[PDB]
Amino acid sequence: PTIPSRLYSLLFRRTSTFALTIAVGALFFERAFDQGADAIYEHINEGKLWKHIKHKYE
Amino acid sequence: SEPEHDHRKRMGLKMLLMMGLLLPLTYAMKRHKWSVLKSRKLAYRPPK
Amino acid sequence: SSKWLDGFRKWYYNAAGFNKLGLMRDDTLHETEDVKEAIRRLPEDLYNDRMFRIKRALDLTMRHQILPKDQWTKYEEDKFYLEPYLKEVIRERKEREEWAKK
Amino acid sequence: MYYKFSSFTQKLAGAWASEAYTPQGLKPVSTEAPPIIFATPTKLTSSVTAYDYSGKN
Amino acid sequence: MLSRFLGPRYRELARNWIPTAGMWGTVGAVGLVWATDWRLILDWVPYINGKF
Amino acid sequence: RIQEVDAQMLRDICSKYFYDQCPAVAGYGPIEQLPDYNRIRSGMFWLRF
Amino acid sequence: TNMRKTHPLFKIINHSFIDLPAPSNISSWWNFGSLLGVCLMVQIITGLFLAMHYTSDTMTAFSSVTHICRDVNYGWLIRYMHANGASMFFICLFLHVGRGLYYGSYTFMETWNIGVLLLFAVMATAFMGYVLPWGQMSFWGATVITNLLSAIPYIGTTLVEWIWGGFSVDKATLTRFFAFHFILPFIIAALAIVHLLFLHETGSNNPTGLNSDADKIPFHPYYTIKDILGILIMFLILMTLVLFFPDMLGDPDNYMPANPLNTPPHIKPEWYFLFAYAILRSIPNKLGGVLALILSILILALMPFLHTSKQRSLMFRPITQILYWILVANLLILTWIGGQPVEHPFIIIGQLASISYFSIILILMPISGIIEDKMLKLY
Amino acid sequence: ILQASEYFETSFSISDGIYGSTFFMATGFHGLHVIIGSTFLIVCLLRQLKFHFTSKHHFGFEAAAWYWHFVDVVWLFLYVSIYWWGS
Numbered sequence: 013p014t015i016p017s018r019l020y021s022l023l024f025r026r027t028s029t030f031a032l033t034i035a036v037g038a039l040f041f042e043r044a045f046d047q048g049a050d051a052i053y054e055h056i057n058e059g060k061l062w063k064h065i066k067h068k069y070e
Numbered sequence: 071s072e073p074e075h076d077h078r079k080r081m082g083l084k085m086l087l088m089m090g091l092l093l094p095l096t097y098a099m100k101r102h103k104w105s106v107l108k109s110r111k112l113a114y115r116p117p118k
Numbered sequence: 119s120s121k122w123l124d125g126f127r128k129w130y131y132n133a134a135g136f137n138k139l140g141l142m143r144d145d146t147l148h149e150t151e152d153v154k155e156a157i158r159r160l161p162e163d164l165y166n167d168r169m170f171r172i173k174r175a176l177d178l179t180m181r182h183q184i185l186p187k188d189q190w191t192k193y194e195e196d197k198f199y200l201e202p203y204l205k206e207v208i209r210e211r212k213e214r215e216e217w218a219k220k
Numbered sequence: 221m222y223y224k225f226s227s228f229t230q231k232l233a234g235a236w237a238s239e240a241y242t243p244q245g246l247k248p249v250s251t252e253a254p255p256i257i258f259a260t261p262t263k264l265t266s267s268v269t270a271y272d273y274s275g276k277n
Numbered sequence: 278m279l280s281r282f283l284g285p286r287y288r289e290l291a292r293n294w295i296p297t298a299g300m301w302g303t304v305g306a307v308g309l310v311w312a313t314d315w316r317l318i319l320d321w322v323p324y325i326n327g328k329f
Numbered sequence: 330r331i332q333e334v335d336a337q338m339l340r341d342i343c344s345k346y347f348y349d350q351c352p353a354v355a356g357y358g359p360i361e362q363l364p365d366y367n368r369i370r371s372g373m374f375w376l377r378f
Numbered sequence: 379t380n381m382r383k384t385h386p387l388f389k390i391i392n393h394s395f396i397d398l399p400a401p402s403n404i405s406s407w408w409n410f411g412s413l414l415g416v417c418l419m420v421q422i423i424t425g426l427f428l429a430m431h432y433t434s435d436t437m438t439a440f441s442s443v444t445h446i447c448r449d450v451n452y453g454w455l456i457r458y459m460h461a462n463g464a465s466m467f468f469i470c471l472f473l474h475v476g477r478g479l480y481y482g483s484y485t486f487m488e489t490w491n492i493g494v495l496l497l498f499a500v501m502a503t504a505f506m507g508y509v510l511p512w513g514q515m516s517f518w519g520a521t522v523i524t525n526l527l528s529a530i531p532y533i534g535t536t537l538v539e540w541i542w543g544g545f546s547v548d549k550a551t552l553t554r555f556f557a558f559h560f561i562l563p564f565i566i567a568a569l570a571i572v573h574l575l576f577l578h579e580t581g582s583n584n585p586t587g588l589n590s591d592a593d594k595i596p597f598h599p600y601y602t603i604k605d606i607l608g609i610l611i612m613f614l615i616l617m618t619l620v621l622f623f624p625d626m627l628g629d630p631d632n633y634m635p636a637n638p639l640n641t642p643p644h645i646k647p648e649w650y651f652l653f654a655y656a657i658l659r660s661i662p663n664k665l666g667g668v669l670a671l672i673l674s675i676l677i678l679a680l681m682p683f684l685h686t687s688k689q690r691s692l693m694f695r696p697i698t699q700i701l702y703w704i705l706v707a708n709l710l711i712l713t714w715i716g717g718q719p720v721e722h723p724f725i726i727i728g729q730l731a732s733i734s735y736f737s738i739i740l741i742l743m744p745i746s747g748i749i750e751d752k753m754l755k756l757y
Numbered sequence: 758i759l760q761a762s763e764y765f766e767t768s769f770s771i772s773d774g775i776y777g778s779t780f781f782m783a784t785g786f787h788g789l790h791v792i793i794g795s796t797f798l799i800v801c802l803l804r805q806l807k808f809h810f811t812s813k814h815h816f817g818f819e820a821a822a823w824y825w826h827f828v829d830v831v832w833l834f835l836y837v838s839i840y841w842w843g844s
């Protein structure tokens with residue numbers, strides 16, 4: 013009834029459920045990783061990219 | 071000369087973060103599937 | 119030859135480094151037809167000892183380890199077990215070659 | 221003659237008299253016990269899995 | 278000429294392999310909508326609707 | 330107790346005790362065609378379930 | 379019953395990659411071989427996506443490459459990974475040959491000879507691919523090295539007129555170089571199949587050089603995941619070399635259009651040819667320089683008959699280890715000298731470097747082998 | 758250390774009104790108490806590296822965990838009362 017036993021049992025034990033876990037995690041990882049890397053890139057280049065100066069020239 | 075410069079650097083940042091995630095995990099898989107062999111002990115039984 | 123050649127032989131035996139894998143000298147010889155025939159002519163005890171030492175060395179070189187220093191093969195205790203068999207095989211091959219010459 | 225405990229199911233199965241009631245053979249003298257050598261000096265401990273620590277106590 | 282599999286045992290095998298084949302089909306559909314970035318299903322999901 | 334056994338609980342019990350489990354392998358004889366522990370362990374589950 | 383051992387197509391894959399016995403102690407260097415195959419596929423795949431937009435014409439080759447970089451979606455990515463993948467291909471190739479030399483892998487003579495055929499083919503493929511973008515350096519490097527290939531009396535001038543398809547390098551040379559550059563990686567792939575086939579009759583070598591039949595493991599899952607990890611490390615190095623330093627290994631003079639009347643102050647090939655270039659100009663005779671380049675690349679073929687020790691690997695030969703590392707150092711010096719202009723003191727350094735290179739491979743290593751044989755009390 | 762950083766980079770001092778006085782005084786005693794807790798954890802860590810805590814009689818880390826949970830619930834009260842609500 014412990015959490016790692018049930019996490020193995022209903023997610024990792026079956027191979028089709030393993031693949032479903034991998035696919036859903038891939039989609040959510042794509043969204044979160046794209047947001048994180050885009051935010052890091054726009055912070056490192058604060059005021060330099062076009063979207064930071066796009067509002068001045070409407 | 072390089073209109074792709076900023077997009078290249080963004081893709082490189084994503085590459086660096088993804089590789090820094092992926093390398094210890096793949097190394098861990100190698101260490102698992104090879105740690106079945108690297109802890110192996112051999113013995114010898116000569117009959118004399 | 120008296121003073122340092124034996125000392126240089128001991129130092130070179132330490133420096134070459136097959137003693138710290140537990141190997142003897144004749145285990146390190148690369149196989150030819152002559153060496154394979156000499157190995158085939160070995161008795162069962164020396165053959166089994168050789169093959170265990172070889173796979174122990176392969177185990178040690180897998181993990182990038184060496185034997186402890188007390189288990190290093192000593193220079194004086196290193197026996198040349200194979201080379202009479204190898205010399206006999208080389209001699210009979212030379213006899214066959216010189217007969218094929220004439 | 222009749223029953224010998226065997227057969228991997230832990231059962232008193234049926235077996236011949238020469239092995240059920242004479243389990244020790246007719247060989248006269250035990251010959252040797254060849255010892256086991258290892259590659260590295262291993263700590264082959266039967267009881268309590270050698271020692272458990274992480275430093276000097 | 279597929280009359281060799283008309284019996285209760287193959288029906289038993291079939292009802293054993295309904296959920297695994299259905300879950301593999303679910304994996305295939307989710308992977309297809311994930312790889313193609315298909316707009317029919319990806320607009321029905323909360324968190325992935327961020328770039329639209 | 331034998332009459333209680335049907336197919337569903339039998340394959341549930343067999344999946345509980347066999348599926349995705351690490352075996353103990355002992356061998357004696359000419360056993361180099363006997364595979365390593367990784368292939369024997371990988372054979373204890375199906376990729377299709 | 380099972381398809382892995384009875385199906386005639388899966389039997390080949392099982393015999394070559396799944397139940398293949400491999401030595402249990404091979405280091406990371408062996409991964410380089412599989413990396414080479416991966417690079418080949420990468421190059422081929424990226425090459426195909428350069429071929430969907432490249433126009434082999436002297437008016438519209440440079441312009442087509444700029445259109446690939448500036449207007450094709452992610453075309454800059456594909457072009458620069460093709461270039462840096464050629465560089466990574468040569469890095470992995472050099473370390474593959476160095477592994478072959480150090481651990482005595484040239485005793486597989488058929489595998490070694492199919493290897494040096496593969497090396498010749500990939501050098502010619504990289505040459506014609508570098509001619510393909512039709513910049514200043516492409517045109518002038520092609521003209522220089524083909525004109526010195528013309529040095530053979532009574533034969534070389536007809537051969538260079540036949541190779542050029544005209545009086546000098548022109549549109550016919552560019553188009554036939556495009557056809558040859560496209561088609562040579564498939565002969566390379568078939569020769570790699572023959573390379574692997576000639577290897578698998580005897581099995582791989584191990585760093586100790588001993589008979590590994592006492593302890594061998596299947597290729598799956600061990601070396602499968604080991605080569606996967608090597609592929610990931612290689613892709614780190616390659617994508618760092620594309621996404622961060624896309625023209626550190628390149629040459630800026632290739633970014634002007636090919637002006638046939640603009641001779642550059644320096645003319646160089648790419649770096650992976652440069653050592654042979656420094657063996658080329660180390661002799662002040664054109665026949666001598668070209669033939670010395672041929673011997674400097676075919677001394678690898680001569681190598682299996684220059685083995686004198688009763689051992690195989692250099693793991694238990696310290697003097698020959700020292701001579702090998704002096705050889706690698708000399709090769710590095712030759713690369714630097716071939717990068718350098720033909721002035722003082724580079725001419726004497728290059729001459730001594732080539733002399734020491736041929737002396738170390740030809741003379742000094744069998745002498746060191748027989749010295750170590752006498753030193754180990756067996757001769 | 759990053760509480761010292763927000764002490765360095767705040768817009769007001771302890772003499773800057775009753776809000777500054779209350780906030781800095783409460784956070785100052787919280788910082789003092791978490792320094793005491795960190796020192797107590799350092800002491801029990803150095804005791805455990807010398808093999809002192811057994812499997813049952815390990816009251817030093819029990820007191821450390823109780824003081825640390827106290828510091829945690831007090832910081833939750835400062836987060837609600839001073840930071841989130843009322844500001």
Ligand SMILES: CCCCCCCCCCCCCCCCCC(=O)OC[C@H](COP(=O)(O)OCCN)OC(=O)CCCCCCCCCCCCCCCCC
Binds near residue numbers: 696704711727731
């Ligand atoms: C007798 C030596 C005793 C050494 C003792 C060292 C300290 C021992 C106690 C501490 C332990 C240190 C680590 C031990 C390492 C292994 C043992 C060892 O020291 O080996 C010495 C090593 C190999 O030994 P060996 O092969 O016998 O040496 C022959 C010398 N040529 O040999 C060496 O290290 C010497 C290597 C010399 C290499 C010189 C190369 C000069 C030429 C380079 C040219 C490059 C190209 C230049 C360009 C050419 C064109 C212009």
Ligand code: HEM
Binds near residue numbers: 415582
């Ligand atoms: C076209 C590039 C090449 C490819 C794709 C290639 C491919 C391979 C592959 C897949 C292997 C087996 C894996 C391994 O053991 O590393 C291998 C091994 C080998 N290759 Fe190559 N190779 C190439 C170039 C060469 C060259 C130029 C040589 C000769 C100098 C060579 C000689 C060898 C040898 C001797 C082995 C045996 C390894 C051993 O047992 O030690 N290869 N190659």
Ligand code: HEM
Binds near residue numbers: 508563
């Ligand atoms: C069949 C596979 C291949 C095809 C179709 C192909 C095609 C091309 C094309 C069209 C170009 C010119 C486009 C450009 O320069 O960006 C090119 C350039 C090049 N190719 Fe290939 N190629 C292939 C394989 C290879 C291989 C295996 C190598 C490595 C030996 C290689 C090395 C190069 C190099 C070095 C360049 C020049 C890059 C530069 O512009 O600096 N190619 N290739």
